[PDB]
Design an enzyme around this catalytic site. Structure first.
Site, mmCIF file in Angstrom:
data_model
loop_
_atom_site.group_PDB
_atom_site.id
_atom_site.type_symbol
_atom_site.label_atom_id
_atom_site.label_comp_id
_atom_site.label_asym_id
_atom_site.label_seq_id
_atom_site.Cartn_x
_atom_site.Cartn_y
_atom_site.Cartn_z
ATOM 1 N N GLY A 46 -61.488 -18.795 11.814
ATOM 2 C CA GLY A 46 -62.281 -18.279 11.449
ATOM 3 C C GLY A 46 -63.548 -19.148 11.439
ATOM 4 O O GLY A 46 -63.603 -19.695 11.601
ATOM 5 N N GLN A 51 -70.706 -23.883 10.505
ATOM 6 C CA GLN A 51 -70.525 -24.876 10.908
ATOM 7 C C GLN A 51 -70.410 -25.374 12.214
ATOM 8 O O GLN A 51 -70.419 -26.166 12.891
ATOM 9 C CB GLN A 51 -69.150 -24.533 11.047
ATOM 10 C CG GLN A 51 -67.785 -24.598 9.742
ATOM 11 C CD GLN A 51 -66.633 -23.971 9.641
ATOM 12 O OE1 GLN A 51 -66.681 -22.858 9.705
ATOM 13 N NE2 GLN A 51 -65.804 -24.399 10.552
ATOM 14 N N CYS A 92 -59.160 -26.550 9.351
ATOM 15 C CA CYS A 92 -60.515 -26.241 9.749
ATOM 16 C C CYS A 92 -60.838 -26.210 11.159
ATOM 17 O O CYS A 92 -60.829 -27.677 10.814
ATOM 18 C CB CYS A 92 -61.205 -27.133 8.543
ATOM 19 S SG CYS A 92 -63.020 -26.164 8.681
ATOM 20 N N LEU A 93 -61.845 -25.712 11.203
ATOM 21 C CA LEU A 93 -62.001 -25.885 12.707
ATOM 22 C C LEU A 93 -63.380 -27.352 12.925
ATOM 23 O O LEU A 93 -63.952 -27.635 13.338
ATOM 24 C CB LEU A 93 -63.500 -24.932 13.688
ATOM 25 C CG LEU A 93 -62.076 -24.221 13.516
ATOM 26 C CD1 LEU A 93 -62.903 -22.370 13.975
ATOM 27 C CD2 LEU A 93 -61.360 -24.482 14.643
ATOM 28 N N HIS A 134 -61.979 -19.589 2.150
ATOM 29 C CA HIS A 134 -62.613 -20.471 2.739
ATOM 30 C C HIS A 134 -63.156 -20.446 3.485
ATOM 31 O O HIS A 134 -64.334 -21.792 3.375
ATOM 32 C CB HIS A 134 -60.945 -20.807 3.619
ATOM 33 C CG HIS A 134 -61.788 -22.340 4.851
ATOM 34 N ND1 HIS A 134 -60.506 -23.218 4.868
ATOM 35 C CD2 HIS A 134 -62.193 -22.525 5.771
ATOM 36 C CE1 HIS A 134 -61.353 -23.650 5.730
ATOM 37 N NE2 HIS A 134 -62.151 -23.460 6.479
ATOM 38 N N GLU A 135 -63.877 -19.858 4.462
ATOM 39 C CA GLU A 135 -65.436 -19.821 4.498
ATOM 40 C C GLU A 135 -66.283 -18.772 4.073
ATOM 41 O O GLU A 135 -67.391 -20.082 4.207
ATOM 42 C CB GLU A 135 -65.753 -18.088 5.932
ATOM 43 C CG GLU A 135 -63.740 -18.134 6.872
ATOM 44 C CD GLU A 135 -64.412 -19.335 8.206
ATOM 45 O OE1 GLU A 135 -65.425 -19.749 7.810
ATOM 46 O OE2 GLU A 135 -63.527 -20.421 8.265
ATOM 47 N N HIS A 138 -67.995 -22.130 3.161
ATOM 48 C CA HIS A 138 -68.904 -23.258 4.010
ATOM 49 C C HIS A 138 -69.802 -22.933 3.515
ATOM 50 O O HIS A 138 -70.697 -23.554 4.140
ATOM 51 C CB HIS A 138 -68.192 -23.189 5.927
ATOM 52 C CG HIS A 138 -67.144 -23.707 5.770
ATOM 53 N ND1 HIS A 138 -67.265 -24.908 6.289
ATOM 54 C CD2 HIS A 138 -65.913 -22.954 6.314
ATOM 55 C CE1 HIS A 138 -65.488 -25.259 6.780
ATOM 56 N NE2 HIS A 138 -65.252 -24.391 6.988
HETATM 57 ZN ZN LIG Z 1 -63.214 -24.472 7.682
#
Ligand SMILES: [Zn+2]
Length: 167
Positions: A46, A51, A92-93, A134-135, A138
């Site tokens: 995702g 990000q 998470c990236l 989660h996204e 962000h």
């Molecule tokens: Zn993330």
């Protein structure tokens, strides 16, 4: 096709609140394709535009193992459909290398615009319910380490600051 740089905690730009997309044009679709190539190359399932330092409300995902089910959610929103919570060890990236349990509603209804700008909804459970929450977090400038104890977050933050210094 560009691989974009993914911001990493504690870059303050990850706290910015993303602005809604007012028209889904070809510029937005090109960004989506770059966000998908960035997410597939990471690799991650995702990725929110915040990000990659694009503060617009766009999330891409692909939960499959073979990169065969891309999903796009523009101006996403979700509403929990239960108070029951599931615990999932998230990563998470933008918090590379860390995976920690976060509890979130088990099922939610997403509303968003698709890649053509048309509105749709979708009920999500399982990993899709975790990922969309989660996204969407962000886009609101929140990260999953915000749910953790403050001492774990600080420990993660210091580890990443150290890595960023060595890199
Ligand atoms: Zn993330």
């Amino acid at each position: 096709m560009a691989i974009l740089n993914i911001l990493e905690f504690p870059d303050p730009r990850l706290r910015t609140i993303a602005k809604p997309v007012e028209v889904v044009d070809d510029a937005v679709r090109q960004l989506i394709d770059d966000m998908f190539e960035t997410m597939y190359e990471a690799p991650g399932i995702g990725l929110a535009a915040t990000q990659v330092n694009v503060h617009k409300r766009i999330v891409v995902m692909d939960l499959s193992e073979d990169k065969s089910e891309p999903r796009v959610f523009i101006n996403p929103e979700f509403e929990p459909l239960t108070e029951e919570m599931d615990q999932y060890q998230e990563g998470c990236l933008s918090v590379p290398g860390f995976y920690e349990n976060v509890d979130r509603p088990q099922k939610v209804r997403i509303k968003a615009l698709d890649r053509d700008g048309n509105p749709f909804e979708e009920v999500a459970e399982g990993l899709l319910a975790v990922c969309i929450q989660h996204e969407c977090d962000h886009l609101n400038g929140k990260l999953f380490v915000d749910y953790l104890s403050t001492l774990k977050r600080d420990r993660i933050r210091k580890k990443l600051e150290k890595q960023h210094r060595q890199q």
